[PDB]
From a paper:
In this study, we sought to investigate the impact of changes in Omicron on a uniquely immunodominant spike-encoded CD8+ T cell epitope. Peptide minimization and HLA restriction showed the immunodominant response to be encoded by a HLA-A*29:02-restricted epitope, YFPLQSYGF. Analysis of the amino acid sequences of the HLA-A*29:02 epitopes in SARS-CoV-2 variants showed that while the ORF3A-encoded epitope was conserved, the Omicron BA.1 variant contained amino acid substitutions at positions 5 and 8 in the spike-encoded epitope. Despite strong functional avidity directed towards the cognate peptide, we saw poor reactivity against the Omicron variant.
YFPLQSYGF peptide was refolded with HLA-A*29:02 and then crystallized to understand the basis of peptide presentation. The two residues of the peptide that are mutated in Omicron are at positions 5 and 8. While the substitution at P8 from a glycine to a serine is unlikely to impact peptide presentation and conformation, the mutation at position 5 can have an impact on the conformation of the peptide. The P5-Gln is buried in the cleft of HLA-A*29:02, and modeling of a P5-Arg shows a steric clash of the large and charged side chain with residues in the binding cleft due to the presence of large amino acid residues Met97, Tyr99 and Arg114 that occupy the β-sheet floor of HLA-A*29:02. The P5 mutation in Omicron is likely to destabilize the peptide human leukocyte antigen (pHLA) complex and could also weaken its binding to HLA-A*29:02. To confirm this hypothesis, we refolded the YFP mutant derived from Omicron with the HLA-A*29:02 molecule and performed a stability assay. The result shows a dramatic decrease of the pHLA complex stability by 14 °C due to the mutations in the Omicron-derived peptide. The single mutant YFP-P8S in complex with HLA-A*29:02 exhibited a stability close to the one observed for the YFP peptide, decreased by 4 °C. Interestingly, both the single mutant YFP-P5R and the omicron variant of YFP both exhibit a similar Tm of ~46–47 °C which is 15 °C lower than the stability of HLA-A*29:02-YFP complex. This shows that indeed the mutation of the P5Q by P5R is destabilizing the pHLA complex.
Residue numbers in the entry:
A (entry chain E): 1 to 9
B (entry chain A): 1 to 275
C (entry chain B): 1 to 99
Write the structure that this text describes.
Amino acid sequence: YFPLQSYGF
Amino acid sequence: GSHSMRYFTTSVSRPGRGEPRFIAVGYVDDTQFVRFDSDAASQRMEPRAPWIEQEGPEYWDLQTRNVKAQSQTDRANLGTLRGYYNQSEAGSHTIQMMYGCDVGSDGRFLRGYRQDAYDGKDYIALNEDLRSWTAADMAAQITQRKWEAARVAEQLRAYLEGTCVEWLRRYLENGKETLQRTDAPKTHMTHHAVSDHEATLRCWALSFYPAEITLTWQRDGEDQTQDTELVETRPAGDGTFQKWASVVVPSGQEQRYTCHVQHEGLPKPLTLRWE
Amino acid sequence: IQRTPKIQVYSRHPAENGKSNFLNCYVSGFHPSDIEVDLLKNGERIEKVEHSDLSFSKDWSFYLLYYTEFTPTEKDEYACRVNHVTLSQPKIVKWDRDM
Ligand SMILES: [Mg+2]
Ligand SMILES: [Mg+2]
Ligand code: NA
């Protein structure tokens, strides 16, 4: 399971 | 006995030619089970192993959502890094990311990972404690301040210690007949004349799973590294792996050499000797 | 950073003349991801050629498996041709049934 982890640089 | 779960994401900018190319893959040990490719027709997270197909629609929709959000964040991220490294819109750039965990044979949590690379080099990484970061330079230190301010490590640690290990244990049970099988290598030895004074002996290990294997040569029960070759482990294409090791021996002394094979699927190590 | 591809040409199974099998070209340890890989029969390109989905190792270098169905003979010769930005020339690795 790939969790929601959309962090911007 | 030990197990791993890995997600690899790749984002390549293609200036002029359109939006970045995105590819995501999911592995349980040495077996790929999911994929997402931006260039594909579906626009969905897709199964790559027969076991994962049994999952319901909510799983596939949540996986699609999470992987699409990753590809889209990468497009913003590709633009922001051009800003940080004062780079041109004409060149191609890559963002790489790895997420995953390690469990023991008993199923306990061993390790969590979150690492990001820019153009093949380290950008930022979550440390083993899952509470601090390692930034590779000044630009990765801008990202670090943001991530420390926004408490990114706590969310990741919760996913790794919770979610990651639970889903892995679930995959291992549901995918047992593939994931937890230990296909012992089928072995054999070949022989080739090099000169009438020297000959090559090749020691083969085929159809094995998992990929971890040790192949060694011995001369009269003593370690031999001189005049030896070892190819890196390669996929056979059907989920199994291949490996070989060779030694150049003097003619008539073939019987003095043994090839020792060690794999999880073997109760005791096998020793091969030419006829 | 830049990294040169390691190349291996081999069959899925021990080759037997007249028996269907798979021909493989395993390219690994390269960076960037842009790569051209061709499987050749008697010096000419095979067109129905599949590849694995792009993935990478600890060091961030990529790997891919290129493959095709084929039936070996005593006549027919096979090889894999790889072009990458790190190569001054497209590398051709010949298929050896005992390698
Ligand atoms: Mg989630
Ligand atoms: Mg076989
Ligand atoms: Na082979």
